[PDB]
């Protein structure tokens, strides 16, 4: 989709006050300080499953064009057949 909608984030559920509350927040802080974040990207996020295009980088184009090129190959085999029939046509035509 386009862009940010209702900026927000995630965290740990906290009811009233917690014995682990503030120090837990600190733990989050240290998490931002350390690379365990990008490490978590390694756990999931950083994995690149699929590509991201805008235009169509088809510059290969090959298997798509295989009908036109291999079609030319059909012109070649047609060269064998029609060249053999016509070969008898002019060859035996001189005969």
């Amino acid at each position: 989709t386009g862009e940010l909608f209702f900026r927000s984030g995630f965290g740990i559920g906290m009811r009233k006050d917690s014995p682990w509350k503030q120090q837990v927040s600190l733990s989050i802080l240290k998490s931002h300080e350390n690379g365990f974040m990008e490490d978590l990207d390694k756990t999931w996020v950083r994995y690149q499953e699929c590509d991201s295009r805008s235009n169509a980088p088809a510059t290969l184009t090959c298997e798509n064009m295989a009908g036109v090129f291999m079609l030319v190959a059909g012109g070649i085999v047609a060269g064998i057949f029609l060249i053999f029939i016509e070969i008898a046509y002019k060859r035996h035509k001189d005969a």
Binding site: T1, G2, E3, F5, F6, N55, A56, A58, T61
Partner: protein, 50 residues
């Protein structure tokens, strides 16, 4: 020029404009755009004006 057609081409847009996105902003049965029942952001819809 034909090659240019093969490359350059419209392939029209994806819609999905914004919070003001017209398709979303135009009540009809044509398109279906929503979220799941009983969600937090769903609540972000549940308290709204526009």
């Amino acid at each position: 020029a034909n090659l240019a057609a093969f490359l350059v081409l419209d392939r029209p847009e994806e819609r999905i404009t914004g919070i003001n996105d017209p398709r979303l902003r135009n009540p009809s049965d044509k398109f279906i755009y929503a979220t799941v029942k009983q969600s937090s952001v769903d609540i972000y819809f549940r308290r709204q004006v526009e």
